[PDB]
Ligand binder design. Sequence first.
Ligand SMILES: C[C@@H](CN1CCC(Cc2ccccc2)CC1)[C@@H](O)c1ccc(O)cc1
Ligand SMILES: *[C@@H]1O[C@H](CO)[C@@H](O)[C@H](O)[C@H]1NC(C)=O
Lengths: 46, 49, 444, 51, 387
Amino acid sequence: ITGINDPRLRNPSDKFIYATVKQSSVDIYFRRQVELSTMYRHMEKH
Amino acid sequence: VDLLIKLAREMDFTYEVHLVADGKFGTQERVNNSNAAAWNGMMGELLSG
Amino acid sequence: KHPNMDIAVILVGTTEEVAIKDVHEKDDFHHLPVTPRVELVTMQESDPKSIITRICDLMSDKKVQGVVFGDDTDQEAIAQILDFISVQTLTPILGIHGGSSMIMADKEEASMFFQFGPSIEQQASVMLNIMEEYDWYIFSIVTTYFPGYQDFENKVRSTIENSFVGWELEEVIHLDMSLDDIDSKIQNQLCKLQSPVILLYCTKEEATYIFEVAHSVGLTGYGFTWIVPSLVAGDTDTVPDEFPTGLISVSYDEWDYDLPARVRDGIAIITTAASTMLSEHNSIPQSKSSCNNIQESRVYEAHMLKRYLINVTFEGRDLSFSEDGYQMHPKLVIILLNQERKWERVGKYKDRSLKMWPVFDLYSEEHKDEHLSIVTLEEAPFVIVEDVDPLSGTCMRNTVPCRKQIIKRCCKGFCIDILKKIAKTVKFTYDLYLVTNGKHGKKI
Amino acid sequence: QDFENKVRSTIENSFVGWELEEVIHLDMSLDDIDSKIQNQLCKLQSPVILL
Amino acid sequence: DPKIVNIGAVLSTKKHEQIFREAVNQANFFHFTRKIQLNATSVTHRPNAIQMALSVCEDLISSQVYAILVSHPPAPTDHLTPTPISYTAGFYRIPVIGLTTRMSIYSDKSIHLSFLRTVPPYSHQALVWFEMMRLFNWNHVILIVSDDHEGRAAQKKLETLLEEKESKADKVLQFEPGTKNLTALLLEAKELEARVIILSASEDDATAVYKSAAMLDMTGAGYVWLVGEREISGSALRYAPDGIIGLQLINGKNESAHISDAVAVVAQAIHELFEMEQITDPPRGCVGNTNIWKTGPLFKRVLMSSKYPDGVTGRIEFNEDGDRKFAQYSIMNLQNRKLVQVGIFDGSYIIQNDRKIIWPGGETERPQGYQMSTRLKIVTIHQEPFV
Ligand SMILES: C[C@@H](CN1CCC(Cc2ccccc2)CC1)[C@@H](O)c1ccc(O)cc1
Ligand SMILES: *[C@@H]1O[C@H](CO)[C@@H](O)[C@H](O)[C@H]1NC(C)=O
């Protein structure tokens, strides 16, 4: 994973999972922040 | 814990510890009207006391 | 043995002296255990004294156990008045049209009052669905001190927090119509807001003043758009043109079902509640109606009726209420002010889901005119078609809708983003779909 | 606008990125019931005003 | 030519009606009668809400009242018996002024938008408590409220006062009315370190509160009690604990002083009003008018801003909600199981009467609060590296 901004994240795939805990503060980072707000949803899955 | 007891030797306080019921630390949630309930988890315990 | 209930209904207005009398009440669904006994009365123009006097007058010894109210009027206040009588009588009252249907302050729990207008919360939800459909993400709210504020602000807050999209709430404004202004204090605030999409909430009369002031401020023009709840549009029969054109608002449809059909719904609800309450306790709901004296004994027992009456179903149709007394999900129509004085329908919305007709560049611009539909094809990375989450029911984040004739597909990618920035800069709206024959152009 | 023009040259020539926010032209003639001057003036958010 | 401008009111007794008319005539005599004259109309309280509302639409509004005054009836029925008028006048935006309604539910402009009063609500009593809290330096307290618009409003007001400071919710405790046993909630209260308590409830509820509180011996020293006027009064007084601190609004019982003053203010407001043009008379009679009265909100605006600081009741100014400002209360103490004035509160500053301070249990002087907690309850989560 090249960076915090990873094209691989930016290029999400159903085939390549990226996983987190719902209600983890990271999720709060995803919801509160507008700039990456699109990217949150892919993480939300699984 | 070692930090806490380090403080406890440093600080006048005495400590009793219990883990929060919810596995989550805390997050805002629940009902719509006004602002309702409070963030679930240990943080919620802190405000609740 | 024979359990005949006592009921009364009133119509105000109707644009007739000799308003259509007793059109309904004709036996339908007679199977229901209690048969209705109906007394119908009409009164021409509304008053607190006239209505209070008449409703108590019909109460007399008559002992009516239910009332339905209906009006030609645009008046907000009426519902509350009848509600007050209900609080006093503990006699159920509901209304099928106009002002009674128009929203009101949160009803006293002990009190029994119902409205066939939509819930404030529901309406706010529909307003949000409308904004999401056109993907207008950034918006502000102008409100007034009229009841339901903060139930509305809260409802918007709840509805907004949950969604993934990076929408922006810019400002919320609370201005008292009371302490009416020399200051044009409303002008002084309203002038501040820069946001493109505005939700307004107030009494029918207040909307006029706020709009004249907005016309002075320059808020009605050119790219800004306004969205409104049931109250302002009211009947929709009469429309001061002080309201700007392109004004967007939701209301109940007259065309789908006429007022007598609606009254039939009300009667059906009252007698169904009576039948269910009967089935439970085998007990007559009938009670002494007279307001002047103390409320009749065992009327205090009536609470359970409300408990029974909240959800009622007949004709394969649900009347289910909400704790506030608005019906849970009446069918609703998305309406716009067509050029000139027309209120012309744009959308239909029901239960969970909403459907709207126009594709693109919705809604006579001085700088420029018409609308542009666009076609594309899927290629990676540049134009990517994705299947939208079925649970969500509509596209998420950067994804913009595109349709393919063969089903809604969600397009996002390089072309989508470049197009999006371009649309933002040149300021026009557009409809996007997918090509069928031959993808990128081919010569045979 | 000659005032505007002189300012446009003076402000423009300099390397610095100062910002002109709004320029407002209002006729004292056709005196207002509308408080059109209030309606314009209320809008501007800038800290420093040349009148 | 003279013009007769009517006023209307609902009052407890015919004697008070005569007092009303007398005050009105004093207003006429002392202000220009050539330009304008004031006329008085009034009616006794009716048994139900409905007879009275009908009275307003028929007996009063037919006289074209520019404003209405209202007072609590001789035997209070439920509460907020002057609820209907605020609604009824409100339709036409006719300003209403209550004399005796200290009820808080009228403070929200939304539901009652025509309502003004010559007395502050029970919620505004918190102004005292904050000042009280301010003097004694207890930042830590506990709040016990009944669950209703009244209690919640009190909580909102006090918390809003605290918001200027770092927000202080030391603890807050909500109970629902009509509940005879409150013991568990107080058991929860003792655990909280802060030893000072403040409560708002109805008399009947307060009986239960003190009854439950005495069982757990929270009435003892090291604990402080602050309360509303209603709490010290009635059956609640009988079961009340010693050393409690209490409040009584001045001239709260008297309608008449408030009558003379309210009418004086109305007169000043009108005479100030007619200085303005594009005025319209209020609607003649309830019948046939579905429309509001455009002047009414303006009449409200001037009337809220209407000064005239010299009055029989005290200083007069009105807050945003139309509630009165700068009212005066008399602090009360329970010494020897009897009510005594330890001090009196007027304006924004408390005043200390010569009487000795009493605290609950035996104290010559004992301002004690907050104790200290010798224990820390610590919480954690299951995270592998640090736990
Ligand atoms: C809600 C209305 C007052 N509201 C309550 C009383 C009702 C008249 C009535 C008379 C007799 C019996 C029952 C009811 C008329 C409507 C007012 O507060 C308001 C209006 C608009 C606004 O921005 C702020 C406040
Ligand atoms: C003055 O009040 C009396 C009631 O005492 C009433 O009869 C009369 O009509 C009133 N005058 C006006 C002009 O309203």
